Design a protein around this ligand. Sequence first.
Ligand SMILES: [Hg+2]
Ligand SMILES: [Hg+2]
Length: 255
Amino acid sequence: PEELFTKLEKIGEVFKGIDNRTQKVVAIKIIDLEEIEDIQQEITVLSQCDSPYVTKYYGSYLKDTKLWIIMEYLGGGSALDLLEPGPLDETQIATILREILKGLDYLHSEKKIHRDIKAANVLLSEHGEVKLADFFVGTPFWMAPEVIKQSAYDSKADIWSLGITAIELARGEPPHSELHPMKVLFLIPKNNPPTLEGNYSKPLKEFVEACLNKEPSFRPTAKELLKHKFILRNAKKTSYLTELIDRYKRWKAEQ
Ligand SMILES: [Hg+2]
Ligand SMILES: [Hg+2]
C-alpha cells in the first residue's frame, strides 16, 4: 500500500519517514478519517503552493481509513522551539523575519493569505532554512483587529500578525500572553496597538510599529518590509541560524 515510505519515530499523528525511492526524509501526517472538510481544504492549498519558503507537499494517500499526507521534513524545530533556551539577538530576529517576509511575499503575490503567522508556524531545516507552515480564523494573540471583528480583510492581516511575531521573536511571547484568550479578543480591537518595549534598536521598534497599524492600508506590504532598515542592517546568512538550532538541541538534552 503505502510502502513507498518507511515510517520512523513519531515527531493526527506526525512521523519522520523515508522515501524508499530516493532515501530522502519526509514528514508523514496520518489522520484517521473515521470534520474532513477542513483537512480537505488544507491539502488543496498546499498542493497549490510551490515555494522554497513554504513547506512542500509531496502527496496524499489513503490506506484503509487512514490518510497519509507526505510533507517536507524540517528538523531544525520551529522558531518557537528556538526561543525556549533564551533570547534571540537582533541578527537572528532580522534573518528569521526576512525569510518569513519572502514567504509572505510569495503567498501574497499568489493571492493567498496565511492567516496564522506566529513563531510556532515558522519551521527551520537542520541547515537553518526558514519556511512557513500550517495553512474568523487564526490564533487570537496574533490576529489582526479586522480579523477579530469578522470585518473584511486581505493579506494586510498577515502583516499585523508579522508584527506580533516580531514582538514574540524579540520578547519570547506575544502581547497579552498572560490573559485569557477571550479577554484578548476584546482588547485587540479596543486598545491602542502593541509596541515593542525594552532595550531594542530603533529600527526594530519601528519595524514593529509599522506592522502594527490598526488601519490595514497603512501597513506596508511584505515586499516593502524586505527593504526596511531593520531587515537591511541586521539580516545575515540563514546558515548562521545553525547556532540557534544547536543551542536548542543542547538545551533540550539537559531537560
Ligand atoms: Hg500554501
Ligand atoms: Hg500557494
